[PDB]
Amino acid sequence: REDAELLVTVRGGRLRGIRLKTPGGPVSAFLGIPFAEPPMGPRRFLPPEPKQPWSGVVDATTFQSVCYQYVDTLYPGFEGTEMWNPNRELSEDCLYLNVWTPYPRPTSPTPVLVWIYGGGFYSGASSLDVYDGRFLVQAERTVLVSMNYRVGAFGFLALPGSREAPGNVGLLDQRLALQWVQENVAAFGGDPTSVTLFGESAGAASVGMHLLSPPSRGLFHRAVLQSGAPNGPWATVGMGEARRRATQLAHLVGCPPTGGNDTELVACLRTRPAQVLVNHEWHVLPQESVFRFSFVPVVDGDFLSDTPEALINAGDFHGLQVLVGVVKDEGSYFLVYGAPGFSKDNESLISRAEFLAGVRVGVPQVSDLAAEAVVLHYTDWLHPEDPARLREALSDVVGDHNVVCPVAQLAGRLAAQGARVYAYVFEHRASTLSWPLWMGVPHGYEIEFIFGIPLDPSRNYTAEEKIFAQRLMRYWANFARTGDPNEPRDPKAPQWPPYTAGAQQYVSLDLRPLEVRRGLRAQACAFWNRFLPKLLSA
């Protein structure tokens, strides 16, 4: 009749899950568990209300809907873009989370990994193939949780001060999910006293924001930030600029029939079909740019009491372990989304004039003086016009400014103020990668190795990549268990030393064994982190 392993009771009522086959054995999956009331109609732009209790059994047996979001059409049918696109129907009814646990359920409480996806806060879903929790769970016997959270206007449109669209509700979705894990994860055999958040890009920035918001901070114990940071220039917005964008979006969809009463304005926004808001979303940004997203977390004194920069500098982080890193070519992926001269389908050997124009696109909303400073640092003045070098340098500009230097700065401050920090650079280019060779190791392409996706028999990774995947999964789960990625009791394997503000040590992750190196682009990030902000104040 019924399999007891696939049956679990949580505070809201009863759940039925599914038994998944994995290469190494079975896993129990509870997919599409409701954790909030659907943020529908009157509840659009509002904080999540906890899911009301239910009688009977909810089938948590497949991923639920993707939150409404823009769908990338740059390269239709192309694997490199389609792998990030929604693989379920779009709906505002999307606040569901997923739990993977070993089969049979653990007898003693087990460390929990909680995944937060990225996607510039305008996109993403926990149902993407590349976030499939089944391989980590089988290989490392952790519990894995992932949640959907609202993105775009639905998650981060903000009219600061107003009760009808307070902003940051996407982050509140994540927090509600974290609360859910505390109350309920023990029913799946997981340890609420050992929870590790990990995320990539906007998900890493989310992880960092939970670090800096005290009501989140009690809900977990460690953090992993992959290729993103909360202090990233794309990751937050000021109250006034948020209002400006909300208001311009309202305006572009006929609300009201500009500004006025906030209650009236939001009520008119609530009568618009979801798809209509999505179609106008990209038209509210101040300047045309790769790498900037219309609706993002707002610094408003509530969720974030100050800018993440301030909060990072002022924080005491004793008792905290953090794992951070970047891929080898953070910037390259973004250039084909607007930098003049770039395409995945040619070598993108740009001119000097194209480089200068690309700097403005890749570093939006800085003064001319600031742009000149960037051109100075990044030009090789013995080869000022070599196209290949210019292509590489623009990739460096975009990557450094948006990912590498925000991460480096976070890493150095956390270390200096009490946290044990570990840092990596991911340097392996997947044999299956469909982006062109000039992009090197692009943003996002470590994720599939962390999740053990190469162990999927239907895919065509090499045996060495499968070994590599297993190494990474081991590092991540070691860190989740102990706060230290190093093998507890393995000596003759090279050690991953902590990252500190002085020595700035990190390891390279690739097919070769760990190599220790110094400095997360230290010379470059001194420009972005130490000097440029002094210039913007003058």
Place this chain on the structure above:
Amino acid sequence: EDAELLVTVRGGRLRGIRLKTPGGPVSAFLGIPFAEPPMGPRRFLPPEPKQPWSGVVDATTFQSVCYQYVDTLYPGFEGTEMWNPNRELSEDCLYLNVWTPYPRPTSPTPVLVWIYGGGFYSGASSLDVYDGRFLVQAERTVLVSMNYRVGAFGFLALPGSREAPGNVGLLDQRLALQWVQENVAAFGGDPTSVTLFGESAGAASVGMHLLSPPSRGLFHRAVLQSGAPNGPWATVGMGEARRRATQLAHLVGCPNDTELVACLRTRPAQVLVNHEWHVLPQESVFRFSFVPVVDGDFLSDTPEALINAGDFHGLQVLVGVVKDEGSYFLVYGAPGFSKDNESLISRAEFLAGVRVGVPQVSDLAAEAVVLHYTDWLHPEDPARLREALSDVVGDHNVVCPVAQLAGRLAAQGARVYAYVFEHRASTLSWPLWMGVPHGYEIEFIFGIPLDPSRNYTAEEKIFAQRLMRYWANFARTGDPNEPRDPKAPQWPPYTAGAQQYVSLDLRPLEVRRGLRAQACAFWNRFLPKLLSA
């Protein structure tokens, strides 16, 4: 009586002296007066041409050194005393010197004219290290050098006033160049082939004659060693010149420009000298109180402006620098530095040093300097900080201004040759940490190592001879390369794109690219934008 040592010039008759060199004799005429003594009412005024004399001027010894400050940082030390005056001080100092082959040439011989450096506050044509005898004998040029007024005497300016118009030290130099045009043929020199060369403020001076049309017809080619007229230390604006002149007056008890200059003229020369260092705005190495002023007369615009606008087709220029331009200057005010230890400074000392070595810029400007010159993998390592501050000082004051001059001239039609001088003299008395310091290529250019009473190596004498040949080749033809010499490695012209220069040392010529191009991009391209906005 030796007829070779008798010469008549426009003003009258002269008697010279025969000098010895290891390669044979040379004729020297030393202490030739080219101006009326700029004394009394003539202090601060433009030079007047020397009135004609009767009888024979004795031109057998160096004349007096123009009044200047005497360096007392290391009393008796060779490294400093070799630049100090070696004749008594006097305002009656406007004399020049001519060295010629013996017997005097009987066909037009190319002329080299030497303008000394010393920050526009010091220097003399009589210093041992500027001895013309070896170049003249070895390369068969005529060599001329002049004294010109320095310090307040040469560059005190109350702009708009006719009592202290400024730049008269530059006019001293021009008047000597005019003297060369009118009189050098009498020595066998060719007035249609005159090459100016100079080092530091002398190099800045050469550049300034390039950029001033009344000087430009007085010579044909130019050599700028470790200096440039666009140096941040080489000129001053009218407003700031007036302020400095005014603060000198106050410091020496003087109170209307006419009244002010009149009072200054009543003061003993030594009194002006004693106060000159104390008129500068802030504590600094590498800044000098009285320098050329940009007032629309001698210089119709800034040398930067003039350089960018100029048409320089038909000009050949030789420019260059020593391997370590900054190091010598650091012992004159950079905290932590001494010639008598390793000068392994702390980062606090480094940061303090940056404000001294790059004076009168905003905190933002200094921060940017500190950014570009810090190794952020090793922000506090003493040796690297010592080296980096040497780079800051040398790049800012010498290398990048020379690089900018070279680039602009080449791109606007000049043929430019560039070098880096990388040989450390076996006899050098400054510490090893200073490398090849400012000034220490000069002795090789003048062939001082051929002097048998000095202790240079055999290889160093051969190197001196190479350099004298390059310099003389350039003077004769606008090209330092050995005219027809196939298998010897060639010195290519410097261009804005390829930026090629050669290294000068005991090794054969080696071609390299870029005069600290990454660093000078900062000083020449970014930093001006910053200060403007």
